[PDB]
Amino acid sequence: MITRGEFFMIKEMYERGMSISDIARELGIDRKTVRKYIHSPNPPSKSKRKQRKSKLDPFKPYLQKRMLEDGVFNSEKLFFEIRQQGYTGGKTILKDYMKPFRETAKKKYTVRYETLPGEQMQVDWKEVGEVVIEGKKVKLSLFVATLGYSRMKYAVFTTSQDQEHLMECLIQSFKYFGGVPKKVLFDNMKTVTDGREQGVVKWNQRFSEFASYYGFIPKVCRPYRAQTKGKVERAIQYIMDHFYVGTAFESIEELNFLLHRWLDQVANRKPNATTGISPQERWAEESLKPLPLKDYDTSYLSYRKVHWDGSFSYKGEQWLLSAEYAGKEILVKERLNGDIRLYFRGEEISHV
Amino acid sequence: MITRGEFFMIKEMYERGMSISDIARELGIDRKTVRKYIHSPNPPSKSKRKQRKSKLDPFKPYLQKRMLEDGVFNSEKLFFEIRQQGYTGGKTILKDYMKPFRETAKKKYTVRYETLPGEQMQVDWKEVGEVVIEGKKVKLSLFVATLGYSRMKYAVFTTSQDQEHLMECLIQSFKYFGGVPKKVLFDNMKTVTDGREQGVVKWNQRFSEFASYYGFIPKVCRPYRAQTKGKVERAIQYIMDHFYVGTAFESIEELNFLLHRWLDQVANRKPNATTGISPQERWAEESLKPLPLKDYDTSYLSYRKVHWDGSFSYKGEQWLLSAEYAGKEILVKERLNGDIRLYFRGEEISHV
Amino acid sequence: FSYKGEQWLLSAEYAGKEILVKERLNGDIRLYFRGEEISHVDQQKKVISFAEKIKKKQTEMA
Numbered sequence: 001m002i003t004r005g006e007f008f009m010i011k012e013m014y015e016r017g018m019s020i021s022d023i024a025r026e027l028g029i030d031r032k033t034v035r036k037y038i039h040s041p042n043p044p045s046k047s048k049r050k051q052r053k054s055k056l057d058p059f060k061p062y063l064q065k066r067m068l069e070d071g072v073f074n075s076e077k078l079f080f081e082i083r084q085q086g087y088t089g090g091k092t093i094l095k096d097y098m099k100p101f102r103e104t105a106k107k108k109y110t111v112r113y114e115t116l117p118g119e120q121m122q123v124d125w126k127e128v129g130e131v132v133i134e135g136k137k138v139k140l141s142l143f144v145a146t147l148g149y150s151r152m153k154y155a156v157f158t159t160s161q162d163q164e165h166l167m168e169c170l171i172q173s174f175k176y177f178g179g180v181p182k183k184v185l186f187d188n189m190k191t192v193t194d195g196r197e198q199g200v201v202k203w204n205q206r207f208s209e210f211a212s213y214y215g216f217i218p219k220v221c222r223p224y225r226a227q228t229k230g231k232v233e234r235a236i237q238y239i240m241d242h243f244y245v246g247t248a249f250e251s252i253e254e255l256n257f258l259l260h261r262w263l264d265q266v267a268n269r270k271p272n273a274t275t276g277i278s279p280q281e282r283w284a285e286e287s288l289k290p291l292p293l294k295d296y297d298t299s300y301l302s303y304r305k306v307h308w309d310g311s312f313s314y315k316g317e318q319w320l321l322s323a324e325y326a327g328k329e330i331l332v333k334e335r336l337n338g339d340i341r342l343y344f345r346g347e348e349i350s351h352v
Numbered sequence: 353m354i355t356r357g358e359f360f361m362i363k364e365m366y367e368r369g370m371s372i373s374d375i376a377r378e379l380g381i382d383r384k385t386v387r388k389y390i391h392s393p394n395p396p397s398k399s400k401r402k403q404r405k406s407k408l409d410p411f412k413p414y415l416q417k418r419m420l421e422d423g424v425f426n427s428e429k430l431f432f433e434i435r436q437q438g439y440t441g442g443k444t445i446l447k448d449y450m451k452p453f454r455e456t457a458k459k460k461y462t463v464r465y466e467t468l469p470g471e472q473m474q475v476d477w478k479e480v481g482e483v484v485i486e487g488k489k490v491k492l493s494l495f496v497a498t499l500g501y502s503r504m505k506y507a508v509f510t511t512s513q514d515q516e517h518l519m520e521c522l523i524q525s526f527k528y529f530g531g532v533p534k535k536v537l538f539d540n541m542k543t544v545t546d547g548r549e550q551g552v553v554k555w556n557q558r559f560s561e562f563a564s565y566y567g568f569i570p571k572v573c574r575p576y577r578a579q580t581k582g583k584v585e586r587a588i589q590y591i592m593d594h595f596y597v598g599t600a601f602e603s604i605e606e607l608n609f610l611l612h613r614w615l616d617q618v619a620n621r622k623p624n625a626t627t628g629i630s631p632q633e634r635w636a637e638e639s640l641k642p643l644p645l646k647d648y649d650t651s652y653l654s655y656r657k658v659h660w661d662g663s664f665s666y667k668g669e670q671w672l673l674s675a676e677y678a679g680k681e682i683l684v685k686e687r688l689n690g691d692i693r694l695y696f697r698g699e700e701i702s703h704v
Numbered sequence: 705f706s707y708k709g710e711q712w713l714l715s716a717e718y719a720g721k722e723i724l725v726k727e728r729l730n731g732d733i734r735l736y737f738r739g740e741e742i743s744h745v746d747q748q749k750k751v752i753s754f755a756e757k758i759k760k761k762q763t764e765m766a
């Protein structure tokens with residue numbers, strides 16, 4: 001088992017012409033050993049041995065059954081049990097054998113990553129809570145979109161977290177940043193996925209079409225791990241401890257106006273604590289893909305029938321449609337702003 | 353403002369007979385100052401000055417209103433607001449003024465106390481959960497009583513946390529320890545208190561009578577602070593991670609038998625990690641007050657009426673009472689073990 | 705904290721921090737924290753349980 005260096009030295013000194021016996025004398029090795037190593041391929045310094053029997057082998061299946069069906073992980077309890085069965089050794093071997101079965105405590109070290117310019121964006125929601133806006137109880141939610149390289153922040157308040165609202169907020173973010181990223185990171189929302197099909201993710205077909213339309217590649221971090229999108233979560237903490245702490249409002253339009261003004265004043269103006277530069281300069285450094293001229297229409301699409309007289313009803317509303325549109329089927333495109341339009345076989349109805 | 357030592361030296365050297373001028377020369381003080389201090393009561397080394405005006409005085413009421421009604425504690429937001437009002441200074445003064453109003457983050461240091469022998473005991477409950485025992489869903493609870501000086505542990509399982517069950521478990525603990533403590537520490541349970549009447553505690557009248565009967569003085573730690581009774585909580589963790597982890601059972605009597613055997617085997621036998629001695633030896637060192645001969649009767653007491661024929665019904669049960677006990681009022685003493693006894697004006701009924 | 709099977713009680717400032725114990729071959733323990741020197745722990749030949757140390761600190765603070 002002469003080590004790498006010893007074998008190299010033996011072979012080299014032997015090939016140099018030095019006599020073998022005095023080589024052995026110099027290296028303090030037996031002459032037979034040195035001569036055998038002369039005609040050897042490479043330094044031998046490794047011995048392979050397979051596993052061997054231990055004391056806790058007969059009890060091992062029983063302990064495994066205890067762990068995997070009774071959920072017992074108390075080394076003292078298992079030791080006391082098996083001691084009656086016949087075991088006589090200490091607990092160290094038991095702990096060493098049982099350690100792999102124990103759950104892996106979550107780490108505390110946190111890797112840091114710096115995405116390339118115009119290469120990544122992050123999105124998330126924040127359930128603000130229930131408020132009485134204009135005498136109406138609604139569930140307010142905050143949508144936050146954080147750029148990855150410039151740390152920009154766009155935000156907007158909404159009353160619902162429907163796929164339509166998500167897509168519209170993404171449109172607003174893309175317009176705000178003057179382009180679309182090459183990658184957009186969400187969490188595992190059903191408006192973007194439909195579960196992990198054996199490790200792989202199954203994208204919602206409509207959302208996949210939307211992404212292919214705007215060209216941005218979706219990504220999802222992982223189940224029950226929000227660290228991977230720390231930028232946007234920390235931006236949420238920033239906004240909810242700086243803007244929505246004492247600000248008072250009565251209309252969501254007013255709140256959104258105040259939020260945009262606040263962002264453009266301080267949030268996207270104050271230099272970041274890590275990049276140490278105003279986010280707008282980095283934004284100017286960003287290179288996002290151009291937006292399409294026509295935005296992906298995100299509006300509720302329903303089919304309704306006009307009554308005999310010509311009175312058409314949608315939600316708690318009523319219209320008066322010409323007699324030619326009575327008893328037929330029409331399309332009611334409801335934009336998220338409340339602009340309802342009526343269509344009949346492509347044509348647009350001048351609804352009264 | 354000559355300090356204590358300087359004044360002492362001046363007075364002493366002057367009274368010794370040393371000339372005053374060379375005293376002043378030696379101590380590097382003016383002759384007038386030294387002479388004035390000669391006839392002085394005590395060393396003058398303190399100057400008292402009252403508060404003075406600052407820059408954030410006019411804004412202080414507004415900031416206080418913001419904090420106390422809008423809940424804003426973001427120094428950046430308040431600074432940005434008041435800067436428009438006219439403030440021109442830095443944020444350090446703002447943070448210093450606003451610090452007292454901020455909530456006091458909980459400490460992490462933990463005082464350690466060692467009660468005197470036979471002087472303190474602690475009690476607590478542990479809601480194990482819901483189990484199907486004998487095809488019946490019951491809410492299992494664990495009652496734990498930990499001695500303070502010997503760290504003994506008594507425990508018992510129960511289906512309810514009623515004042516009657518609490519008192520009976522206390523009786524069992526006192527019998528187990530061979531005596532009653534001089535102090536018993538609970539948490540703020542309504543079976544022992546009725547709320548903090550302006551800081552002071554109002555003891556439940558029945559429980560107060562029970563305590564006065566057994567002579568042990570009750571105590572309650574504080575609202576929302578379980579550290580003060582760490583012994584019993586840690587004993588609960590011990591029992592729920594050592595005994596009730598994999599043990600299987602079908603009857604609560606079996607579970608209690610196993611629990612008592614386990615306690616007397618290991619729990620009250622293994623030396624403690626801090627006292628470093630077997631709890632039973634310290635128990636032998638304990639000096640508890642003697643138990644009363646007759647235990648405080650903890651049994652449901654209800655008054656019922658016997659039907660015309662003589663059929664008396666309690667819960668889903670039926671009896672057959674002699675005709676002389678028909679149409680009258682009787683007492684149904686239900687012991688917690690299920691021993692129902694019938695009483696009629698002190699006499700006991702030989703119910704069939 | 706702990707040292708060679710004996711548990712010592714420090715003050716509030718030292719809780720949650722790494723101290724350095726230096727023990728001469730003579731047999732005396734000296735606790736150095738953050739370069740400075742902290743109060744001696746009056747090491748005794750007879751081992752005293754953590755409970756007795758808690759009681760002693762309690763009486764001292766009393």
Ligand SMILES: [Mg+2]
Nearest residue numbers: 124125126187
């Ligand atoms: Mg989310």
Ligand SMILES: [Mg+2]
Nearest residue numbers: 476477478539
């Ligand atoms: Mg409790």
